[PDB]
Design a protein around this ligand. Structure first.
Ligand SMILES: Nc1ncnc2c1ncn2[C@@H]1O[C@H](COP(=O)(O)OP(=O)(O)O)[C@@H](O)[C@H]1O
Ligand SMILES: [Mg+2]
Lengths: 740, 146
């Protein structure tokens, strides 16, 4: 019937007549294929004629170009297109997935299944699929019968928790701007049926944890993990939130075409003059080094409105106003730090300050003493053995120390804020079997990939390895249950090479950290050592490539998506993390909230390992979000961009891994009672017919409860059944004519 | 020779002109009334796959018809109970031994070769239950028994 949903029913699933008319779409598989193009580089066409090695084809847009016959792949039959789940696609191809996704999105179809994944595209308009009636309809619906939707996987996870009594986790990862936040918001209200508090707090976290990327304006750099603590009877009890992998490099440093976090620019907006007056802010972003080096401002966001939204979120919430004032004071103090000059003492390596007025403002902001802070920074004291001794610091060391201190205090601010909202939201009801909802940034591949991109790529690589391990474990468990195993090789080592190059000793990060402590280490030396220790020795590492005039590259890696080239310049300045301790004591001796407050690669590695060890305890669930186009036009979508994101998200590799074994498993009794039409003469007959099918027995495997075989055998069986039943129908027509 | 005598007696009985001549449109009907169940392909290939204009234009005598039935008698492809029941069971969604009449009508009109409504309606006349369904077992008994 499909009519329960009503208004959203056409969007959730098409009606029978459309399927019938599309099925009879007359196309000959022998003449329609996929040909590479020039600007989309993947298009569909039909061969006008075959001329040996070179074949000429006419495309839908209209062109008379010809290509070598080796570059054209088979096209999916019209009888099988617009499939709700593409896991069992008859012909798996890289552009076939793009074609199916665009054909569905043209019929305004959003959610699509890809096996264990759930691929969703981002439109730009309100939709009726989120109607509470739809939520009720999906209540208790499995993945198979119901049309694709995030609620289906949420209910599946809920049922898994109910029946197995174990934690469940749902992971979301897509290119920045794919709408992960919105999807999390929809799923959290689905669980709700406190969420109001979650949405109320969301703007603050977004503003304090986002910045404008060259591809997106509201990228969420850090990852979020929202845990819904349930009861023993599966009733909502409370909510917690955890944040991982905050990018200190963003706060300390910005790129040429990049902005800092939204908060600094928001307070730089003058529509709240009181804050500027009490922060001694000149309203000129170029007067602060930490922000000027990036992008001054953009017209996509009005800033002031975001500031008022964040202020509303803060004010009507668990915490008071003086705490907000303290937070603003400390943020302004962080802004102030980008103005000290210092100077190396003549005839000495120690450095003394010159502009002793920004220090005064900062000390007043924290309530510290300017002289004490300056003395601590210039001459830090450390306890050796049982006695305190001063240390010498040059201009570079003190600059690195102050940058590290500023970024560390910003990170601690973020963590404390997360704790505060979590405490406000938490309530004393019993907590049991929390459900985790993680969202993280995608596998971004820009034209100027750098250290931050490297860290994000490493995190994505670890996530992909976890996904592959989960698939291997599931398949091995299924094989053990069925008593027969196939391809008993784990897929982790199919991906472990990149991880080995990244994290293990003498790896890229280890080598960089080694450079950090070397007396005189420069970027040139870093590249030389990398080449010496890895060039040729490691398969993944290879020389950089210069294509269509990229700005520059230094080396490249072979990730699960493709060859990615990085850059070196600035990495040393972006990895040093000297955390002074005397100033930490000064903060701990401060009359302010700072009392409660108290290398980058190593801390990132530790945070990532904490995340993985937390995740391993939970049963995962995977979702994929992909933007249709750069422009906000909903209907149109760029084929190269979608294909690049599909490669990045690794849907194709996952489905291929699934296909490696014997995905098609059918109950012996069901097969015997259904597909016996092919060979009309429930176990002896099943095996007899299977043996008498006159097909090579290496393709299919004989089980006891479920018969297994590869998709190639399944398609051949289905088509020969179709022709056999066509012959039977023709015989019926002949008999009816005989009746005449 | 007695079988040939019966063939010619039926041919002249079906001859409305007395010249032992018939049209192509009724040759299949004669062959089927004589004990055959051929498809359009079989009745067209014996005539050489003529066109529509030649289908309704030329006439064939018993002498020229003798090779057709002689060759058709060498064909033993006529179907059986098991095949027909297996084919009709797939349409039995509820699996009680009955098939939807409307679904059967639509598939006959779209799938396979379409047939004139009156003959099939007469064939199923009384073969459908009070629910509008046809017990395909009794239908199979009826169609092939005659
Ligand atoms: N269900 C939806 N319907 C319409 N638009 C959506 C939906 N989900 C996301 N979007 C679009 O995505 C944008 C927000 O993306 P966002 O979640 O901030 O990306 P990120 O998670 O990378 O920050 C909005 O402009 C909105 O138009
Ligand atoms: Mg977001």
């Amino acid at each position: 019937e499909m009519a329960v949903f009503g208004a959203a029913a056409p969007y959730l699933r098409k009606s029978e007549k459309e399927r019938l008319e599309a099925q009879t779409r007359p196309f000959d598989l022998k003449k329609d294929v996929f040909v590479p193009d020039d600007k989309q580089e993947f298009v569909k066409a039909k061969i006008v004629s075959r001329e040996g090695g070179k074949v000429t084809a006419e495309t839908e847009y209209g062109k008379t170009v010809t290509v070598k016959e080796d570059q054209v792949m088979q096209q999916n039959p019209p009888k099988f297109d617009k499939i709700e789940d593409m896991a069992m696609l008859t012909f798996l191809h890289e552009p076939a997935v793009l074609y199916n996704l665009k054909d569905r999105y043209g019929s305004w179809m959003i959610y699509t299944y890809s096996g264990l994944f759930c691929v969703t595209v981002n439109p730009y308009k309100w939709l009726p699929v989120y109607t509470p009636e739809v939520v009720a309809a999906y209540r208790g619906k499995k993945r198979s019968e119901a049309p694709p939707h995030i609620f289906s996987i949420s209910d599946n996870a809920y049922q898994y928790m109910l029946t197995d009594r174990e934690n469940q986790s749902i992971l979301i990862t897509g290119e920045s701007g794919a709408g992960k936040t919105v999807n999390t918001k929809r799923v959290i209200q689905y669980f709700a049926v406190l969420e109001d508090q979650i949405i109320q707090a969301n703007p603050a976290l977004e503003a304090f944890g986002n910045a404008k990327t060259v591809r997106n304006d509201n990228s969420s750099r850090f990852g979020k993990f929202i845990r819904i603590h349930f009861g023993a009877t599966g009733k909502l009890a409370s909510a917690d939130i955890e944040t991982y992998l905050l990018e200190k490099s963003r706060v300390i440093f910005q790129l040429k075409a990049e902005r800092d976090y939204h908060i600094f620019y928001q307070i730089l907006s003058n529509k709240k003059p009181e804050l500027l007056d009490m922060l001694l802010i000149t309203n000129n972003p170029y007067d602060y080094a930490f922000i000027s080096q990036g992008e001054t401002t953009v017209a996509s966001i009005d800033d002031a409105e975001e500031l008022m939204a964040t202020d509303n979120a803060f004010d009507v919430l668990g915490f008071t106003s003086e705490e907000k004032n303290s937070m603003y004071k400390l943020t302004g103090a962080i802004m102030h730090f980008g103005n000290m000059k210092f100077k190396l003492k003549q005839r000495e390596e120690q450095a003394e300050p010159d502009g002793t007025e920004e220090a005064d403002k900062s000390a007043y902001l924290m309530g510290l003493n300017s002289a004490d802070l300056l003395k601590g920074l210039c001459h830090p004291r450390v306890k050796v053995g049982n006695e305190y001794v001063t240390k010498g610091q040059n201009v570079q060391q003190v600059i690195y120390a102050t940058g590290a201190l500023a970024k560390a205090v910003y990170e601690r601010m973020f963590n404390w804020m997360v704790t505060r909202i979590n405490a406000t939201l938490e309530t004393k009801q019993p907590r049991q079997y929390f459900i985790g909802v993680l969202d993280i940034a995608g596998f971004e591949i820009f034209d100027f990939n750098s250290f931050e991109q490297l860290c994000i790529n490493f995190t994505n690589e670890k996530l992909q390895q976890f996904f592959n391990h989960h698939m291997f474990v599931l398949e091995q468990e299924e094989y053990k249950k069925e008593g027969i195993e196939w391809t008993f090789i784990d897929f982790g080592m199919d991906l472990q090479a990149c991880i080995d190059l990244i994290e293990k000793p003498m790896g890229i990060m280890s080598i960089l950290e080694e450079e950090c402590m070397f007396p005189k280490a420069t970027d040139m030396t870093f590249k030389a050592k990398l080449f010496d220790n890895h060039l040729g020795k490691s398969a993944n590492f290879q020389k950089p490539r210069n294509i269509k005039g990229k700005p520059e590259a230094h080396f490249s890696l072979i990730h699960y998506a493709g060859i990615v080239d990085y850059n070196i310049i600035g990495w040393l300045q972006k990895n040093k993390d000297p955390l002074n301790e005397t100033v930490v004591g000064l903060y701990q001796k401060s009359s302010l909230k700072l009392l409660s407050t108290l290398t980058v690669s190593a801390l990132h590695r530790e945070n990532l390992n904490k995340l993985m060890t937390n995740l391993r305890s939970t049963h995962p669930h995977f979702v994929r979000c992909i933007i249709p186009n750069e422009t906000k036009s909903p209907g149109v979508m760029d084929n190269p961009l979608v294909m690049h994101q599909l490669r990045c998200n690794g849907v194709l590799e996952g489905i291929r891994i699934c296909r490696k074994g014997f995905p098609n498993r059918i109950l012996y009794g069901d097969f015997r009672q259904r597909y016996r039409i092919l060979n009309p003469a429930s176990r002896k007959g099943a095996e007899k017919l299977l043996s008498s099918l006159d097909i090579d027995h290496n393709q299919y495997k004989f089980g006891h409860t479920k018969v297994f075989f590869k998709a190639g055998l399944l398609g051949l069986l289905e088509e020969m059944r179709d022709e056999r039943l066509s012959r039977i129908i023709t015989r019926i027509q002949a008999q009816s004519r005989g009746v005449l | 020779k007695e079988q040939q005598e019966d063939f010619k007696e039926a041919f002249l009985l079906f001859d409305r002109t007395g010249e032992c001549k018939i049209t192509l449109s009724q040759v299949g009907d004669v062959l089927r009334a004589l004990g055959t169940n051929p498809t359009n392909a079989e009745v067209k290939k014996v005539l050489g796959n003529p066109s529509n204009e030649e289908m309704n234009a030329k006439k064939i005598e018993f002498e020229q018809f003798l090779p057709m039935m002689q060759a058709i008698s060498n064909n033993k492809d006529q179907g059986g109970y098991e095949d027909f029941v297996e084919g009709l069971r797939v349409f039995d969604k509820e699996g009680n031994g009955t098939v939807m009449g409307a679904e059967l009508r639509h598939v006959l009109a779209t799938l396979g070769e379409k047939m004139k409504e009156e003959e099939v309606e007469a064939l199923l006349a009384g073969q459908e239950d009070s629910n509008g369904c046809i017990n395909y077992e009794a239908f199979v008994k009826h169609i092939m028994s005659v």
